[PDB]
């Protein structure tokens, strides 16, 4: 087994020619953000053509262009090619270079994972893609087409593909404006599909509340669904209400639910809490960028304390939460033995809110491992309370305080606690906090005292 993995490098002709023999022999070749261009795709094509062991080829984030992409796909058509995973993400693929796709997909019968995200192929390019995907020999488990300039006209071709395939595990069409009617067509294709779908991501696709009865039908039809991402869509409370009945089915084993920025408010959060209380399988939930408000937060906390809830990660960044909701999180941090990660950044908690949280965390029997309190209007006056937490808490490993109102004095109070070798914290995050060279010296002195301590800025 041989693997090569390059991330973020400027490959000179010198450093490049070195790799050619490797690319001709290795099972795994990843050349991501390596400044590759079309000038290098013939090397890649030749190398790959002579590589019967190659199973993964990733060239994400390189300016290959249509010619470069064309040359690469050409080299993948040897009866010897064994490739299973292919990524041409962000490679400058346009509709102009998609004419080759139908041929490539017909011959690559070993292909299981295809990443074409961030290529502006558009609907014309997508249709050519689906002509390949339609080929009986094309059997993908995973397809990623995030941000490819697709609209509603692409939905029928995609739906037609889903109906006749059975191996699909993951589908991402995020950041394409499919619109309400396009999303309905897609859902219908998923329902009619025999595929045991595990992951579905449709962020920012023009989904509305009107689509939510169909998405409910989709969920119900896929007992294998583990991850559902409907973020950045105007679902609203009504949309959530139409969605929840499917999430509540005994057969639903959803593990991750991403609902970032879905125009959800308190009552919609209420609908979801019903799901939290009944679905022990649900481990990760994001409601970030929704105006849940304190009432919303109160509902979550009460649900989190129910025996039926085993939530492990909760994302509630930018949810209009104030100090008034913090007593309810206290009860959670004190009682819940499942919550390990709590993202509450960009909420106007203030010193009050954070001081309250510190009260619960200043006990040694908590389980919380990661807490984000960035941009929560925390000042120097809240840092002594945080300092105490760092002394007394025996679970917290990471604490994020980026983008707050504190300065050197506040930060210094935190460093003092970290001087103690018994402190549990492994990582303190302080982006965009300004302290003078004097504090920095105290900061770097600590880092050399405790090399295992990560302070990020």
């Amino acid at each position: 087994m041989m693997s090569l993995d390059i991330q973020c490098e400027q490959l000179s002709d010198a450093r490049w020619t070195e790799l050619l023999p490797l690319i001709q022999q290795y099972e795994v070749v990843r050349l991501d953000d390596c400044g590759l261009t079309e000038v290098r795709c013939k090397d890649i094509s030749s190398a790959v053509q002579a590589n019967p062991a190659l199973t993964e080829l990733s060239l994400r984030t390189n300016e290959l262009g249509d010619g470069g992409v064309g040359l690469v796909l050409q080299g993948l058509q040897n009866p010897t090619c064994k490739i299973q995973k292919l990524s041409l993400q962000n490679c400058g693929l346009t509709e102009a270079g998609c004419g080759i796709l139908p041929g490539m997909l017909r011959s690559l019968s070993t292909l299981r994972e295809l990443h074409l995200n961030d290529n502006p192929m558009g609907d014309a390019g997508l249709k050519l893609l689906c002509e390949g995907l339609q080929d009986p020999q094309c059997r993908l488990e995973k397809l990623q087409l995030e941000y490819c300039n697709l609209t509603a006209t692409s939905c029928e071709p995609l739906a037609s593909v889903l109906r006749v395939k059975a191996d699909f595990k993951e589908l991402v069409l995020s950041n394409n404006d499919l619109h309400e009617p396009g999303v309905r067509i897609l859902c219908q294709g998923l329902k009619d599909s025999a595929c045991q779908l595990e992951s579905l991501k449709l962020e920012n696709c023009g989904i509305t509340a009107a689509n939510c009865k169909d998405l409910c039908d989709v969920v119900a039809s896929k007992a294998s669904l583990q991850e559902l991402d409907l973020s950045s869509n105007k679902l609203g409370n009504a949309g959530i209400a139409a969605l929840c009945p499917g999430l509540l089915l005994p057969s639903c084993k959803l593990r991750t639910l991403w609902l970032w920025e879905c125009d959800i408010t308190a009552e919609g959060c209420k609908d979801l809490c019903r799901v939290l209380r009944a679905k022990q399988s649900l481990k990760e939930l994001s409601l970030a960028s929704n105006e849940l408000k304190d009432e919303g937060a109160r509902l979550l906390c009460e649900s989190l304390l129910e025996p039926g809830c085993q939530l492990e990660s909760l994302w509630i960044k930018t949810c209009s939460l104030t100090a008034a909701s913090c007593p309810y999180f206290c009860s959670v941090l004190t009682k819940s033995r499942s919550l390990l990660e709590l993202q509450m950044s960009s909420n106007p908690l203030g010193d009050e809110g954070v001081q309250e949280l510190c009260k619960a965390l200043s006990q040694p029997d908590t389980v919380l491992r990661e807490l984000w309190l960035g941009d929560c209007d925390v000042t120097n006056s809240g840092c002594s309370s945080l300092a105490n937490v760092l002394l007394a808490n025996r679970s917290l490993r990471e604490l994020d305080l980026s983008n707050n109102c504190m300065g050197g004095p506040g930060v210094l109070q935190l460093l003092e606690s970290l001087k103690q070798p018994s402190c549990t914290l492994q990582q303190l995050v302080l982006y965009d906090i300004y302290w003078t060279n004097e504090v920095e010296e105290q900061l770097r002195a600590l880092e050399e005292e405790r090399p295992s301590l990560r302070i990020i800025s």
Partner: protein, 124 residues
């Protein structure tokens, strides 16, 4: 080990760069400039002006830093900037950013000798 002045250039200086044609600019730059290591930097600004131009700001209008420090300076002219905002769909190690461009005055904190930017305070 890097000086504050070096850290400022790594995190905020991209004289020749441009984001107007590249919606994935921030995704590349935040990763390349070591600002997605261990945690996704929530927000960041890149300045597309000559280094010497940004440094000249320390010799321009004195203003108060957001934390009330007094060693902050506002640029006399609006500069070309790219803002990077972490998207709510992000979960480390996956850091997805929204890229936006503006031409605005910048406010930096200057320290040490020579007197150069050591902190990006704001855009106005």
């Amino acid at each position: 080990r890097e000086s504050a002045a070096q850290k400022f250039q790594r995190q905020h200086m991209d004289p020749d760069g441009s984001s107007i044609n590249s919606p994935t600019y921030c995704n590349q730059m935040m990763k390349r400039r070591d600002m997605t290591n261990g945690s996704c930097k929530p927000v960041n600004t890149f300045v597309h002006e000559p280094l010497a131009d940004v440094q000249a700001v320390c010799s321009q209008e004195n203003v108060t830093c957001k934390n009330r420090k007094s060693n902050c300076y506002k640029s006399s002219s609006a500069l070309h900037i790219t803002d990077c905002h972490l998207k709510g769909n992000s979960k480390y190690p996956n850091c997805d950013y929204k890229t936006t461009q503006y031409q605005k005055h910048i406010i930096v904190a200057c320290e040490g000798n020579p007197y150069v930017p050591v902190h990006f305070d704001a855009t106005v």
